Write a protein that binds this ligand. Structure first.
Ligand SMILES: [Zn+2]
Length: 265
């Protein structure tokens, strides 16, 4: 199997490995992209994998050690790919935005790297692997134009988010985010921070504020109450999307819909 750290990376791998080997994802729904704790069973999946796919030590810090052991011909570390380098953005600590799975260009570079490594590992399946990369690239191209069309009219419509995960997607599709607030998903912030957040929402004429799905509706409501800012939801991990050939395209289109549901009109 191909073992991917995060579900969207599993979407990309599942397109390339389709009909050749299974794809498996390590990180559950609602878990921390940085500080999840791998169980011994997860390390064992990793050590047993045909290929491991992850962003790198500045994102999934939780698997850095586990993956040290694994030879280069059996891992794709997306942040380290030569074709990804120039695409890495200043804009989770560290200096560079590591939410790489939301960049269509990096997703393509990721698919290419996975394909190259799988062809080297499984030359008996070269033609199937080639066909799969062909279909992934065709769908990504089609998706890119369609999403690009759907989001173009939303340019200049400002919004805020709670998790600054979206910068690659936003820059690529010309969305205009106003910034983000550090909010606890469980607890509505203290009066002073609630005041500063609400004044920024109003001061900048934000059309929307976008929560993540692990957010209690109450704390979102508290952030938005009495402002005229509409409430939306974004899922940067596509948790409701199943693995398979069309999954990464479905992910990009779903995110666009999620933006457009709130920002529209
Ligand atoms: Zn993040």
């Amino acid at each position: 199997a191909v073992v991917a750290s995060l579900k969207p990376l599993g979407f990309i791998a599942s397109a390339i490995a389709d009909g050749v080997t299974d794809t498996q994802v390590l990180l559950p729904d609602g878990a921390s992209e940085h500080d999840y704790s791998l169980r011994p069973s997860d390390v064992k999946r990793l050590q047993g994998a045909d290929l491991v796919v992850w962003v790198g030590p500045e994102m999934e810090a939780f698997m850095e050690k586990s993956v040290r052991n694994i030879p280069d011909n059996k891992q794709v570390t997306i942040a380290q790919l030569a074709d990804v380098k120039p695409l890495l953005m200043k804009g989770h600590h560290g200096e560079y935005n590591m939410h790489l799975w939301l960049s269509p260009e990096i997703a393509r570079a990721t698919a290419v790297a996975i394909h190259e490594k799988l062809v080297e590992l499984m030359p008996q399946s070269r033609a199937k692997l080639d066909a799969n990369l062909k279909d992934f690239e065709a769908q990504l191209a089609a998706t890119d134009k369609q999403v690009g069309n759907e989001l173009a009219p939303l340019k200049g419509k400002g919004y805020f988010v709670f998790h600054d995960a979206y910068g690659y997607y936003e820059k690529h599709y010309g969305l205009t985010p106003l910034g983000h607030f550090t909010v606890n998903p469980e607890i509505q912030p203290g009066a002073q921070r609630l005041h500063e957040i609400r004044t920024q929402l109003v001061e900048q004429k934000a059309t929307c504020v976008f929560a993540e799905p692990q957010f209690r509706p109450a704390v979102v409501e508290a952030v938005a109450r009495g402002t005229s800012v509409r409430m939306g939801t974004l899922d940067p991990l596509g948790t409701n999307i199943k693995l398979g050939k069309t999954s990464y395209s479905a992910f990009l289109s779903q995110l666009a819909n999620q933006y457009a549901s709130c920002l529209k009109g």
